[PDB]
Amino acid sequence: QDSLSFGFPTFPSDQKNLIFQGDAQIKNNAVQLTKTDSNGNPVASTVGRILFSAQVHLWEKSSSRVANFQSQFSFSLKSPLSNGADGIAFFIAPPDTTIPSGSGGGLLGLFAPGTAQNTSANQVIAVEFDTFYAQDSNTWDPNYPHIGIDVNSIRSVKTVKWDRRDGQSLNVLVTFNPSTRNLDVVATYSDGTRYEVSYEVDVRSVLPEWVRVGFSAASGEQYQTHTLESWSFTSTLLYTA
Template identity: 30%
Template sequence: LTDISLQGIATVTPNGLLKLTNATFRKTGHAFYTKPIRFKDSPNGNVSSFSTSFVFAIHSQIPTLSGHGIAFVVAPTLGLPFALPSQYIGLFNISNNGNDTNHVFAVEFDTIQSSEFGDPNDNHVGIDINGLRSANLSTAGYWDEKDEFRNLSLISRKRMQVWVDYDSRSHRIDVTMAPFDSDKPRKPLVSYVRDLSPILLQDMYVGFSSATGSVLSEHFVAGWSFRVNGEAPMLTLSKLPKLPRFEPKRISDFYKIGMPLISLFLIFSIIFLAFYIARRKKKFEEELDDWETEFGKNRFRFKELYHATKGFKEKDLLGSGGFGRVYRGILPTTKIEVAVKRVSHDSKQGMKEFVAEIVSIGRMSHRNLVPLLGYCRRRGELLLVYDYMPNGSLDRYLYNNPEVTLDWKQRFKVIKGVASALFYLHEEWEQVVIHRDVKASNVLLDGELNGRLGDFGLARLCGHGLDPLTTHVAGTWGYLAPDHIRTGKATTGTDVFAFGVLL
């Protein structure tokens, strides 16, 4: 691997695996062949045929959720220094995504559904030209010998084969997948006809890009071949390096060390355990109705949130208001920083609809919304779990003689972010979402001081073109529109009024 340039968090393991990412949050990893590849005989000529084959695997600490994907990329430079992590997969950033001047061709294997890029699901393969809105895409999988489609899970932790072929005569791009140890299927997974001559320069660099987000994951490339004007050499699968073992060893160590001790003090342990379990069961008791089974993946255990916030200690209190107190926490299993809001809710009436609403809001993905990760329900209270915003709420920088203030450039950036979030809620999401409580304390600032609209505790959903169903006044005095106070009916216009007060 001496001819491979590693950038970002990319490394090579001792046994020869190309490891593009490690267990860190929101980072990029790139690996490029160090020498430029000549794709054209002249600067204005036609792109030659080319072919590549590689074997990759994705390992996520959460088996059902990954931190974004991996991409094969042809780029004009040795690396992509200005590319962002998370949904941008280390390929582009917010300003250059979709620009014709990028001269980038890529094939993405994406494990997160980003509605802003038109992703159909969280397990797809797409052909990208100068941007992340794929020219053509498909759910990950392959066509078997009987011409039947077989799904492949990109986060299965298993090695998978990929072939990418471009024909200079027909301008056809074919992307084919198959399980490890399988022959190349006759029928490609994704095809697209596009002359790449205006896209690619005479000399380009080839390699891989990957990125992590809020979920810890690792991306591996076990083998790779590439050729211009010919089919890429076949990989000798038996000689490729194996993936590391992903099974945790902690359980086996427990049984080796813990079981002999338990056997020595069995009677005392059983008595102690009975009292301990009874106390903990009462302490971590939750409410779980039959209708909540459909929301299982969006529900957190109270025990997990209790440990994440260290018992909801006052020192981790981020703020409080009329609808609850917010605590900072770190989820013990994934080490993700979260903000946990405890909301009093004594009545069961409407709880099913409210939880369904929370789950629906949690599916929204926008760079200027605080991601809602899930919920937990106990007797008399509801807990909402959000992504943690390290720079706190906007009101800290505006009121009560703050030690740190925002300059005008930063303020305009926050204003644009909140406006973008409201436009997404009102116009771009599958249902109209009326926030109902737009104010400075509900605008959170991330690590880069981007404004993110949060606190959907009062939010209500309604279909596009329909009147909102809520008719009671809720929100913060001073931000309420006169017609909202008069009629009790919240609309997108009342959100815009509150936004004007925020300005």
């Protein structure tokens, strides 16, 4: 299809079009990307991801068209600790993507350790909400919580300082304009606190024509819940300037 859209105001338990990988599962009409115990508390060493089953036509070589897409979603992070880790990410990748070996912790379940910072060895665009930055294990991170745009590398090509708020839902809008090639990210807490970051990227030279979109989260030795509460996505192929 030239255009595709779907909306999940909430996440009832009987899903049919979601691919669950790792420890992701539905609980209380929301997706718990990372594992939790009996009483609902976050645990260490856990990775989880979800992907919508239908493939998205990001760009078409023959018509020379590129998709204009928009992803809106909201998540909350909760942890008994004040050092919640490691973060959640919205990503776009080849249709057959799977959790790479040893991609837990700071790799957010998106990259393999050996190639985490090798751009020519990956095919993924992700918007990360990173809450852990210890310079010993996450040597690639700026020294503070942040929102980052990741293009084939765990080391963001662009970031903005971010504030983690326990149990507070963050509303996020991600838009890609094929006409300007700008990937814009706008995140806001209910009180109006706003965060913005954008980067120019030619999705055609990064990803195949058909892809899958989803979310990933992980927790290494430090933990927190990564709760996806709602998600809408729309994509339309367009002839650009």
